[PDB]
Design an enzyme around this catalytic site. Sequence first.
Site, PDB file in Angstrom:
ATOM      1  N   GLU A 157     110.135  87.933 -91.574  1.00  0.00           N
ATOM      2  CA  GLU A 157     109.452  87.535 -90.267  1.00  0.00           C
ATOM      3  C   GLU A 157     109.403  85.918 -90.052  1.00  0.00           C
ATOM      4  OE1 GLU A 157     108.509  89.085 -87.801  1.00  0.00           O
ATOM      5  OE2 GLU A 157     108.597  91.240 -88.472  1.00  0.00           O
TER       6      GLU A 157
HETATM    7  C1  LIG Z   1     103.177  93.596 -86.473  1.00  0.00           C
HETATM    8  C2  LIG Z   1     103.280  93.926 -84.981  1.00  0.00           C
HETATM    9  O1  LIG Z   1     102.740  93.299 -84.261  1.00  0.00           O
HETATM   10  N1  LIG Z   1     104.426  94.617 -84.739  1.00  0.00           N
HETATM   11  C3  LIG Z   1     104.703  94.797 -83.418  1.00  0.00           C
HETATM   12  C4  LIG Z   1     106.282  94.420 -82.978  1.00  0.00           C
HETATM   13  O2  LIG Z   1     106.020  93.012 -83.261  1.00  0.00           O
HETATM   14  C5  LIG Z   1     107.596  92.492 -83.455  1.00  0.00           C
HETATM   15  C6  LIG Z   1     107.884  91.931 -81.969  1.00  0.00           C
HETATM   16  C7  LIG Z   1     108.798  90.748 -82.510  1.00  0.00           C
HETATM   17  C8  LIG Z   1     109.259  89.652 -81.707  1.00  0.00           C
HETATM   18  O3  LIG Z   1     108.451  88.688 -81.549  1.00  0.00           O
HETATM   19  N2  LIG Z   1     110.404  89.758 -81.014  1.00  0.00           N
HETATM   20  C9  LIG Z   1     110.836  88.631 -80.058  1.00  0.00           C
HETATM   21  C10 LIG Z   1     112.361  88.378 -80.324  1.00  0.00           C
HETATM   22  S1  LIG Z   1     112.715  87.377 -81.722  1.00  0.00           S
HETATM   23  O4  LIG Z   1     113.407  88.527 -82.815  1.00  0.00           O
HETATM   24  O5  LIG Z   1     111.564  87.118 -82.431  1.00  0.00           O
HETATM   25  O6  LIG Z   1     113.801  86.270 -81.409  1.00  0.00           O
HETATM   26  N3  LIG Z   1     108.119  90.368 -83.847  1.00  0.00           N
HETATM   27  C11 LIG Z   1     107.131  91.194 -84.210  1.00  0.00           C
HETATM   28  C12 LIG Z   1     107.110  91.503 -85.571  1.00  0.00           C
HETATM   29  O7  LIG Z   1     108.144  91.935 -85.916  1.00  0.00           O
HETATM   30  O8  LIG Z   1     106.467  94.719 -81.761  1.00  0.00           O
HETATM   31  C13 LIG Z   1     106.376  96.017 -81.481  1.00  0.00           C
HETATM   32  C14 LIG Z   1     107.170  96.457 -79.991  1.00  0.00           C
HETATM   33  O9  LIG Z   1     106.779  95.438 -79.142  1.00  0.00           O
HETATM   34  C15 LIG Z   1     105.197  96.625 -81.559  1.00  0.00           C
HETATM   35  O10 LIG Z   1     105.196  98.336 -81.406  1.00  0.00           O
HETATM   36  S2  LIG Z   1     104.410  98.820 -80.144  1.00  0.00           S
HETATM   37  O11 LIG Z   1     102.967  98.402 -80.252  1.00  0.00           O
HETATM   38  O12 LIG Z   1     104.726 100.210 -80.177  1.00  0.00           O
HETATM   39  O13 LIG Z   1     104.976  98.217 -79.032  1.00  0.00           O
HETATM   40  C16 LIG Z   1     104.629  96.519 -82.853  1.00  0.00           C
HETATM   41  O14 LIG Z   1     103.172  96.916 -83.136  1.00  0.00           O
END
Ligand SMILES: CC(=O)N[C@H]1[C@H](O[C@H]2C[C@@H](C(=O)NCCS(=O)(=O)O)[NH2+][C@@H]2CO)O[C@H](CO)[C@@H](OS(=O)(=O)O)[C@@H]1O
Length: 314
Positions: A115
């Site tokens: 992360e």
């Molecule tokens: C720990 C956490 O908060 N996890 C959430 C995750 O976060 C993700 C989002 C992602 C993120 O910030 N993506 C943006 C693009 S990048 O890859 O960071 O550049 N990183 C976080 C942890 O892995 O997103 C999904 C989907 O929204 C959620 O599932 S849902 O509730 O069914 O929607 C899930 O609960």
Amino acid sequence: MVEPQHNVMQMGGDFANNPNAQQFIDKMVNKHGFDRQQLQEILSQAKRLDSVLRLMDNQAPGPNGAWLRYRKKFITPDNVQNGVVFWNQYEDALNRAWQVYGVPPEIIVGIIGVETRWGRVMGKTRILDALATLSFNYPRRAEYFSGELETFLLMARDEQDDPLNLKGSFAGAMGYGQFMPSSYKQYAVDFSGDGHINLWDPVDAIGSVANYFKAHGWVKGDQVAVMANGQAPGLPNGFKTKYSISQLAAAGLTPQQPLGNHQQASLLRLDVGTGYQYWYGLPNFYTITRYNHSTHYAMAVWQLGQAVALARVQ
Ligand SMILES: CC(=O)N[C@H]1[C@H](O[C@H]2C[C@@H](C(=O)NCCS(=O)(=O)O)[NH2+][C@@H]2CO)O[C@H](CO)[C@@H](OS(=O)(=O)O)[C@@H]1O
Ligand SMILES: [Ca+2]
């Protein structure tokens, strides 16, 4: 002294004439007792980030070495060494998370490593900008993100944070574990014990990741995934697949490690360049995908954690 400014009904900025922004403000006032003017002041400073919109579109729903390329982004000497340092620095918190939630240190260390590289890459986007942009200018997931924005403003109000100062990912994820606002609300815990849940406090993040896992079905001591001998080219694969162990055996696979009482598993297929690598995905693997819906993500988290665990023994 007090300046209510009831007459100041129109805010400026990128969301000035956005109907969705205006409806959202009305909801926050009615439902949560927010001061309309204070909210207009906050949102007038929020920026509509087109880059956030473009990325959300690009992420919208061989063998050539795909898994190897993803894997080498996280599993390198530098990363594993930094992971060892993190584990040792917070060993007590990790062991306590294990005792309280039954989630092992390698999983928590792997999650935080993938992360944010253990706090080194927390994100540079203001959470408010990201959430406002996705709530007010992105119809496809506007309802989901509006809920996140609502929770974020409530969080900021409670912990008395300036909503404009907090930064994170393009999707509004925050801290060591990149928790979305709703995940903070439902799963974050004050593991450090100072009375405050801080996503940027490594100890709180450790406990929060553990609680998130337990809440999503993590089975203490259970295997995550077992590599298979053999190939199963015909069968559809991915973390969402489901086959009985008997079906997989009929397809030509055998587990490299005993599967215990497990009767079903998902079929995971990793592209290792020279061909494909098949794995029996057990319930705990699926639990990892509940954090971030991706096979590569979950496999990298698990393997990074294992790499760090082994590197510590040395
Ligand atoms: C720990 C956490 O908060 N996890 C959430 C995750 O976060 C993700 C989002 C992602 C993120 O910030 N993506 C943006 C693009 S990048 O890859 O960071 O550049 N990183 C976080 C942890 O892995 O997103 C999904 C989907 O929204 C959620 O599932 S849902 O509730 O069914 O929607 C899930 O609960
Ligand atoms: Ca705390």
